[PDB]
Amino acid sequence: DEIDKQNQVILSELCKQQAQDLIWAIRTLRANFRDHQLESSPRYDKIEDLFEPL
Amino acid sequence: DEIDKQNQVILSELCKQQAQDLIWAIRTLRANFRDHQLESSPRYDKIEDLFEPL
User: Fold this and answer.
1) For residue B32, is it left (φ>0), alpha (ψ between -120 and 50) or beta?
2) Is B24 part of the contact surface with chain A (CB cutoff 8 Å)?
3) What is the spatial distance between Cα A4 and Cα A11, in angstroms, rounded to a whole number?
4) How many angstroms separate the CA atoms of B25 and B51, rounded?
5) Torsion of Cα atoms, A28 then A30 then A32 then A33, to 10°
6) Among A28, A39, A54, A21, residue whose Cα is nearest residue B34
7) How many Å from the N-terminal Cα to the C-terminal Cα in chain A?
8) CB 3.0–4.6 Å: which of A24, A37, B31, B44 could bond A31 by disulfide?
9) Closest chain A residue to B28 measured between Cα atoms?
């Protein structure tokens, strides 16, 4: 109901996002993506190859 | 005042420490101490040698 006004309301929930310190995030990702590995189990099949380019 | 009873009271503050996951902490330290380095400034003198044996 009142579909037009939703354009504002949805936006009012999209602007409450929390900012992320880019330097901290990238340094943490670099540190914790050098040696840490996933379990080689069928539960984790085809879930590691998504991360190698990253 | 009431010097003896403080043995209990002080204990009640030393027993409130937050539990720390010794796997997460050591993995974070290992990942972050591999390459991250402090500034070589007259303010951080003799502050890097303290962290080497760790």
Assistant:
1) alpha
2) no
3) 12
4) 16
5) 150
6) A28
7) 43
8) B31
9) A32
| Tokens (6 digits) for A42 | 């069928």
Nearest to B30 by CA among A38, A35, A48: A35
> Positive or negative, the Cα torsion across A22, A27, A28, A29?
positive
Between the alpha carbon of residue B15 and those of residues B10, B11, B19, B25, B47, the distances in Å are 9, 6, 10, 20, 32
Which two tokens mark A36? 């840490």
| Chain B nearest C-alpha distance from A41 (Å) | 21
Is the CB of residue B48 less than 8 Å from the CB of residue B37? yes
Q: Rounded to 5, what percent of chain A is helix, strand, coil?
A: 50, 0, 50
